Design a protein around this ligand. Structure first.
Ligand SMILES: [Zn+2]
Ligand SMILES: [Zn+2]
Ligand SMILES: [Zn+2]
Length: 178
């Protein structure tokens, strides 16, 4: 197994996957690492299995159909992965915890959103459709764009949203286009 966390790339107290060489801090993994379960498989391994059990799952999909899907166990899982994929980028540090808004010439968002809040929402089963998860994800970056305006710090929202969107297309097998 790896000696660093797959998500944050730091050593420390790590739980090793029994079916692949990745390791995780307790709270870096989504969902949080399960107390017992021997062997244990990580979310990378659980997502792999879904594709292997239904290879047709990787044919192209329309985003509109993906969003309207109900949050049954397999969609819940894919959203937990996608979220995890964003935390693997170090730049997610800027979007992780609750932000606050006091900049000259800007006004803060009507509806503030952050990754730890999305994380909590997923864990408490507050989304009924994929749409709800993806709306809040995108809200994160959209609030950052509007707030930071022409300050170059706005690029952090573009950068991190690109990670989100690429990984959304991958994980949910969105039909490729130009
Ligand atoms: Zn970690
Ligand atoms: Zn694994
Ligand atoms: Zn089949």
């Amino acid at each position: 197994n790896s000696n660093i966390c797959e998500v944050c790339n730091k050593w420390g107290r790590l739980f090793c996957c029994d079916t692949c060489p990745r390791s995780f801090h307790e709270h870096c993994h989504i969902p949080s690492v399960e107390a017992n379960k021997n062997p244990w498989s990580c979310i990378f391994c659980r997502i792999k299995t879904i594709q292997e059990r239904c290879p047709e799952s990787q044919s192209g999909h329309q985003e509109s159909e993906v969003l309207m899907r109900q949050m049954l166990p397999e969609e819940q899982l894919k959203c937990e992965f996608l979220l995890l994929k964003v935390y693997c980028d170090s730049k997610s540090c800027f979007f992780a915890s609750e932000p606050y808004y006091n900049r000259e010439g800007s006004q803060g968002p009507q509806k503030p959103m952050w990754l730890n809040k999305v994380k909590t929402s997923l864990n408490e089963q507050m989304y009924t459709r994929v749409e709800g998860f993806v709306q809040d994800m995108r809200l994160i970056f959209h609030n950052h764009k509007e707030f930071y305006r022409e300050d170059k710090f706005t690029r952090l929202g573009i950068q991190v949203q690109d990670i989100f969107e690429k990984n959304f297309r991958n994980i949910f097998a969105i039909q490729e286009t130009s």
